[model samples]
Target: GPLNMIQGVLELRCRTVEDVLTPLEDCFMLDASTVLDFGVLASIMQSGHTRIPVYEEERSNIVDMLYLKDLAFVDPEDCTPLSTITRFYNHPLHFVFNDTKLDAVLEEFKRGKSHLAIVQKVNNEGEGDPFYEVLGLVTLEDVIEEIIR
Candidate 1:
């Protein structure tokens, strides 16, 4: 039993990020232009995702993240622009490719570099460093689940 359990755990190194990440269509995100009014707050509360990505001009161009904790003191009546709260939770945006190995992702998470990463794919047609196309997202929890499973 010990050997089997250890073998499964060790196999993490063989797994890839795309195998465990949440697909783009399933991720909840916010637009940078959103106003933090009572209606908007209610919607965010309903979604239940604590960390929501905020895109600048389009969904593919995520500029920052929105941490709900930062809005704890925000008054919905004020209708404050989402940008104001974004400034508070200025966590670095981490990115990973679809083919990246799970163990490497775990290492980064273990080192406290980030809890989540934006998953992307390289566009073959692009010049210079290939342009990246946002594909999905992966989280520390996702990796942990793979281990637990």
Candidate 2:
């Protein structure tokens, strides 16, 4: 409320990504049911995200990313339920904690060559349950753009 976009540019660099996170409330996500239909996959592509998170029973359990390129090889006529082949097409999931430093994140992104990461809040320490709770999403563009802005 106190600052404009340019100020946010500054805040983004000096602050933790949590300050600029695109909250889960506003994120577009794919559910496990989509694993049953390529039509659902087609629908998501219309929106333009090549990398979409695929979640199972719990959104927290986002199992893998649905890479648009991987879908390109599949013929729509195959009519094969995605659930049957998700393991083959999906990629490993990567995550980031809100307190995670930007430089460290960038380092891993480069080394891992991953363009996106799920943002989770470090919710528990010693309880042995979920160490991080889903918070939102972030991308390489989000990080570089913050500085460029």
Candidate 3:
């Protein structure tokens, strides 16, 4: 990430920043306001994500990260609404630019103690704009894997 080794060796691992991101997938998203049956949630678990992103109109408009641990005490067959069993959502949309060095982003993860980040670019016009096109998701593990590889 920081290129601690440049020709020093480890630089080869993260020579390119884009290689660190996990490209976005159109699967396993929960509508931000929907409270479906336990069966609905059960399938989400099967979708291979422990942290489900809750979205509004677009998948990029992430409202919360639903933690699987909240569902640990519930029966998947129980017809109770999820809100009753636990809370509705997590919070925030952490963003990192598409070209930010992996070392920089990794430092942010440590500072904020956050495992997730939304990768995007400033749309149209220029930088410092509010409009960003969501591109991908990055987890701490994703960063570590890149280093190990």
Candidate 4:
């Protein structure tokens, strides 16, 4: 004689970066030369991006990074369309492999004092480039929100 045991089970699925990341494939990104005024910055901030990727000419090649605080410091005159002052743009980007762990990525953000990390992949095509793909972006605020939740 054998005894039968009834068991109740629950299944769970974990979400990956691909799941939460904003896909760039079909999205229109802002260009670096696009003038940033308080109104524009405010709109972007309200949209929930702490750091926004900026491109020099096209969205394919990102040139700089812009922090929310930097935009807040812009002079009143600079906010106007006719002002000659150069618009603010972040310099010296920090990058990381797409497979990087969340803990490591968080540490890099803290050490670099940067809000955004451009995710890149190894270049396979004969371009002799370090990375080929611009995968996803990670921000400090993104991490904090995940932690808080």
Best by TM-score: 1
Q: Which lDDT tens digits does candidate 4 get at residues 26-143? A: 4335565565576665566686665666666556587666655655455544653211222544357777666665666666777865666666766687757565687766666655
Runs in model 3 deviating more than 4 A are 1-9, 12-17, 33-36, 72-90, 125-130
The residue-by-residue lDDT of candidate 2 on 13-102, one tens digit each, is 457657556777676677766643556756877867878777777776777777767676666665655554567764777888788766
Instruction: For candidate 1, write residues 1-149 as lDDT tens digits.
Output: 66655765687888889888888778888888899999998889998777788888778788888877878899889788888788876778888889988889999888876677889988888566778889888988888777666
* For model 2, the run of ten residues with the poorest summed lDDT: 1-10
Of the two candidates 1 and 3, the one with more favorable TM-score, higher being better, is 1
Task: Compute the lDDT of residue 40 as modeled in candidate 4.
Answer: 66
Cα shift from native, residue 61, model 1 (Å):
0.8
For residues 38-129, what per-residue lDDT tens digits would candidate 3 score against the true structure? 66876876877776666777777766666777676565555555444335445455777887777777788888745677778768766575
Candidate 3 lands at a TM-score of 0.68
Q: What is the C-alpha lDDT of each candidate?
A: 0.83, 0.70, 0.65, 0.56
Error of 1 at 138 (Å): 0.7
How does candidate 4 fare on TM-score?
0.62
Q: What is the C-alpha RMSD of each candidate to the true structure, in Å?
A: 2.6, 4.1, 4.9, 8.4
Q: What's model 3's overall lDDT? A: 0.65
